[PDB]
Structures are given as C-alpha cells and as structure tokens.
Scaffold this active site. Structure first.
Site, PDB file in Angstrom:
ATOM      1  N   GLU A  23      22.615 -51.154 -98.124  1.00  0.00           N
ATOM      2  CA  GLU A  23      22.481 -52.301 -97.196  1.00  0.00           C
ATOM      3  C   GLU A  23      23.789 -52.511 -96.423  1.00  0.00           C
ATOM      4  O   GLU A  23      24.219 -51.641 -95.681  1.00  0.00           O
ATOM      5  CB  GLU A  23      22.111 -53.579 -97.956  1.00  0.00           C
ATOM      6  N   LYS A  48      13.294 -48.958 -94.085  1.00  0.00           N
ATOM      7  CA  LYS A  48      14.328 -49.767 -93.514  1.00  0.00           C
ATOM      8  C   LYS A  48      13.662 -51.073 -93.084  1.00  0.00           C
ATOM      9  O   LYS A  48      12.572 -51.052 -92.517  1.00  0.00           O
ATOM     10  CB  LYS A  48      15.039 -49.026 -92.376  1.00  0.00           C
ATOM     11  CG  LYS A  48      16.244 -49.751 -91.783  1.00  0.00           C
ATOM     12  CD  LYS A  48      17.070 -48.909 -90.794  1.00  0.00           C
ATOM     13  CE  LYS A  48      18.325 -49.617 -90.314  1.00  0.00           C
ATOM     14  NZ  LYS A  48      18.901 -48.946 -89.119  1.00  0.00           N
ATOM     15  N   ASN A 102      24.411 -39.286 -98.487  1.00  0.00           N
ATOM     16  CA  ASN A 102      25.116 -38.874 -97.300  1.00  0.00           C
ATOM     17  C   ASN A 102      25.960 -37.639 -97.564  1.00  0.00           C
ATOM     18  O   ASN A 102      26.213 -37.298 -98.678  1.00  0.00           O
ATOM     19  CB  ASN A 102      25.806 -40.043 -96.595  1.00  0.00           C
ATOM     20  CG  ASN A 102      27.098 -40.474 -97.246  1.00  0.00           C
ATOM     21  OD1 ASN A 102      28.006 -39.717 -97.430  1.00  0.00           O
ATOM     22  ND2 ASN A 102      27.175 -41.705 -97.548  1.00  0.00           N
ATOM     23  N   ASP A 154      27.700 -41.760 -82.866  1.00  0.00           N
ATOM     24  CA  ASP A 154      28.395 -42.061 -84.099  1.00  0.00           C
ATOM     25  C   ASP A 154      28.161 -40.955 -85.091  1.00  0.00           C
ATOM     26  O   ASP A 154      27.888 -41.208 -86.226  1.00  0.00           O
ATOM     27  CB  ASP A 154      28.078 -43.393 -84.744  1.00  0.00           C
ATOM     28  CG  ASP A 154      29.023 -43.741 -85.883  1.00  0.00           C
ATOM     29  OD1 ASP A 154      30.162 -43.310 -85.933  1.00  0.00           O
ATOM     30  OD2 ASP A 154      28.607 -44.476 -86.759  1.00  0.00           O
ATOM     31  N   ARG A 158      29.073 -39.335 -92.843  1.00  0.00           N
ATOM     32  CA  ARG A 158      28.381 -40.512 -93.422  1.00  0.00           C
ATOM     33  C   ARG A 158      27.000 -40.711 -92.765  1.00  0.00           C
ATOM     34  O   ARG A 158      26.144 -41.347 -93.345  1.00  0.00           O
ATOM     35  CB  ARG A 158      29.260 -41.774 -93.319  1.00  0.00           C
ATOM     36  CG  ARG A 158      29.464 -42.261 -91.888  1.00  0.00           C
ATOM     37  CD  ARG A 158      30.243 -43.559 -91.678  1.00  0.00           C
ATOM     38  NE  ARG A 158      30.538 -43.798 -90.254  1.00  0.00           N
ATOM     39  CZ  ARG A 158      31.640 -43.392 -89.639  1.00  0.00           C
ATOM     40  NH1 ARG A 158      32.678 -42.991 -90.353  1.00  0.00           N
ATOM     41  NH2 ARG A 158      31.697 -43.359 -88.322  1.00  0.00           N
ATOM     42  N   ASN A 159      26.790 -40.193 -91.539  1.00  0.00           N
ATOM     43  CA  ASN A 159      25.528 -40.331 -90.820  1.00  0.00           C
ATOM     44  C   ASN A 159      24.700 -39.043 -90.907  1.00  0.00           C
ATOM     45  O   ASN A 159      23.804 -38.806 -90.108  1.00  0.00           O
ATOM     46  CB  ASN A 159      25.784 -40.764 -89.375  1.00  0.00           C
ATOM     47  CG  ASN A 159      26.064 -42.242 -89.306  1.00  0.00           C
ATOM     48  OD1 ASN A 159      25.511 -42.996 -90.107  1.00  0.00           O
ATOM     49  ND2 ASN A 159      26.927 -42.649 -88.392  1.00  0.00           N
ATOM     50  N   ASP A 172      20.531 -42.100 -88.164  1.00  0.00           N
ATOM     51  CA  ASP A 172      21.024 -43.179 -87.340  1.00  0.00           C
ATOM     52  C   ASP A 172      21.185 -42.709 -85.883  1.00  0.00           C
ATOM     53  O   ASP A 172      22.075 -43.135 -85.210  1.00  0.00           O
ATOM     54  CB  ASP A 172      22.336 -43.716 -87.910  1.00  0.00           C
ATOM     55  CG  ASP A 172      22.187 -44.723 -89.048  1.00  0.00           C
ATOM     56  OD1 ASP A 172      21.088 -44.793 -89.656  1.00  0.00           O
ATOM     57  OD2 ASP A 172      23.192 -45.418 -89.329  1.00  0.00           O
TER      58      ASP A 172
END
Ligand code: TZ0
Length: 277
Positions: A23, A48, A102, A154, A158-159, A172
């Site tokens: 979150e 989501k 990730n 971005d 992590r994405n 994302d």
C-alpha cells in the site's frame, strides 16, 4: 458512477480477497472463472483498490490507469489487466500476480551473503546469463509499450515485478529523481528517449543486484553533476560491453540514445554469448 464495460467486468462474488501485497492498496486474491472457457478454475491475481482515506482525484487516477491498460493490450513482459469490479461497490482493478515481488527485492535476496560491500537483507545466486536475461525481458516490455506510444515516466527496478516463473513484467506503466533523464529533471520533457535513460539506470540496478544509484550524491547536486558529464561508475561485476550500453542510454543528447528496439536486439545477442559463472 463508472459505466459498465462487459469486456472486463467480473462479478464481485467471483473474487476472494486475501492478504495485502503492498500500500492505492494491492491485495492478493483468487478469481473464479476469469476464462469464459474454464469457469470452474481459480486464478491467483492482484487487485488494486483505493485506501480508506482516499480522495476523488485518487479515484480518477485509478480509473484512468485502468482505461489506459485496456488500450495498451497484452504482452508477456508487462503486468496485464485481467478484469475489473466497477458496479456493485468500490472499484477493483484486477491484474496479473507476480509472486516473487519487485525486481529490486528479488535481486537483493539473491546477493552472495559474504559481500561486506552489499549485504543480503533476506535465495540461489543468479548466473551472468540470468541477469542479462532479466535486462532483455525488461527491454522487450518497454519495446512493446513504446510501440504502443506509452511513455512510462518512472521506469526503475522497483516498478518491475517478477512472477513465479521468473518472468519480468513492467508495472505502473499507465499512471525517483535518480532515474530521471536531465531533460526530465529540468524541462520536464518526458519521451521514449527519457525512458531509455531510466532503463540505463535500471541496467545498473540489475548488475549491482539492486544497489542504490548515485550513492552519497545529494539530489540537490544531481542535475549540475549530470550536465557536467557525471555518470555512475561501472558495477564491479558488469562487462565493459554492458557498461557501454548503460553509458549510451545516458547520452546527454536524447536523439543519440538507442531505442528500445535496438536495445532488445543488442541484449538478444549478448544473452546468447553470455555464459556457468
Ligand atoms: C515496489 C514493489 C511493490 O509495491 N510490491 C511488491 C509486491 C506487491 N505487489 N504489487 C503489485 C502490483 C501491482 C500492480 C497493480 C496495478 O493496478 C492497476 C497495476 C500495475 O501495473 C500495471 C501493477 C503486485 C502484483 N501485481 N503481483 C504481486 N505482488 C504485487 C507490492
């Protein structure tokens, strides 16, 4: 009041909410009969939804993310839209579940324990070929998104999410300064070319097994340092060729960076020549 879209709609009763994944909020869930021709099968999915304390900008962003995902279509190396619950209560957007998390976390957990340099905060080590194969899969996903005229803005380890079968998936993509091209920092110009820059930072993340870019460099200084031709040093365990690729992605002139199309072709070749070590 969201309009119905029977292309994507899944009755809410077909969804069994399980544990939080992070979150909005994302939760693991099981979906009954996603496939019309296999209605008695359950699939693990990520869902989501908004947090309790959400606004009406948070909703409109969630809806626009979903709508962009419907337009962009399916690819093996992106997190794909599977469905939505839009009518009988709070908005749920259903996407592919990636069980290994990730990419940053994934790589970190697979560091050799004995490196005082970069500790393992946790799995089997990744071979050289596996790391290159990771980079290739991310580039393939980005090649697809760019072909669909989607600018990520971005892109970072992590994405990227990793599935049970170690498939890399861009996340994302339908919606931090250390990943931004100079022209994005300054002129807020975001292009396929700035995404290539970010991909170079992401290559560096891969070959440092999830290191933090520009270690000890204050954000405030970074534009000045980049304009002066500062770039990150080669990771200790990176070939000169993969470093060249990183540096090319970090060309000051955006027109001079490779496209994701070329990157895919270069990584395809490198994977095949890469070893056992
Ligand atoms: C930075 C990591 C992070 O936030 N994580 C890692 C695990 C967790 N997470 N977060 C996940 C997610 C997501 C996600 C949810 C989306 O909803 C529209 C869209 C999207 O990209 C297209 C990705 C996720 C997943 N799909 N499968 C498994 N674990 C997932 C939260």
């Amino acid at each position: 009041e969201l309009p119905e879209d029977p292309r994507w709609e899944l009755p809410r009763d077909r969804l069994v909410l399980g544990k939080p994944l992070g979150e909005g909020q994302v939760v693991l869930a099981e979906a009954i009969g996603l496939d019309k021709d296999k209605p008695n099968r359950v699939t693990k999915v990520a869902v989501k939804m908004l947090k309790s304390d959400a606004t009406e900008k948070d909703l409109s962003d969630l809806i626009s993310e979903m709508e962009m995902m419907k337009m962009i279509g399916k690819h093996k190396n992106i997190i794909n839209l599977l469905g939505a619950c839009t009518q009988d209560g709070p908005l749920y957007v259903i996407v592919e579940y990636a069980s290994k998390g990730n990419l940053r976390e994934y790589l970190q957990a697979r560091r050799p324990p004995g490196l005082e340099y970069s500790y393992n905060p946790s799995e089997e080590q990744l071979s050289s070929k596996d790391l290159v194969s990771c980079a290739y899969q991310v580039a393939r996903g980005m090649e697809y998104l760019a072909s669909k005229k989607c600018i990520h803005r971005d892109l970072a380890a992590r994405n990227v999410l990793v599935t049970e079968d170690n498939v890399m998936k861009i996340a994302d993509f339908g919606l931090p300064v250390k990943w931004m091209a100079p022209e994005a920092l300054f002129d807020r110009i975001y292009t396929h070319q700035s995404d290539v820059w970010s991909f170079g930072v992401l290559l560096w993340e891969i070959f440092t097994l999830g290191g933090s870019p520009y270690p000890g460099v204050p954000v405030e200084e970074l534009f000045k340092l980049l304009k002066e031709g500062h770039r990150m040093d080669k990771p200790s365990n990176c070939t000169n060729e993969l470093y060249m690729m990183m540096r090319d992605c970090w060309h000051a002139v955006p027109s001079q960076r490779p496209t994701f199309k070329q990157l895919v072709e270069d990584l395809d070749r490198i994977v095949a020549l890469t070893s056992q070590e």
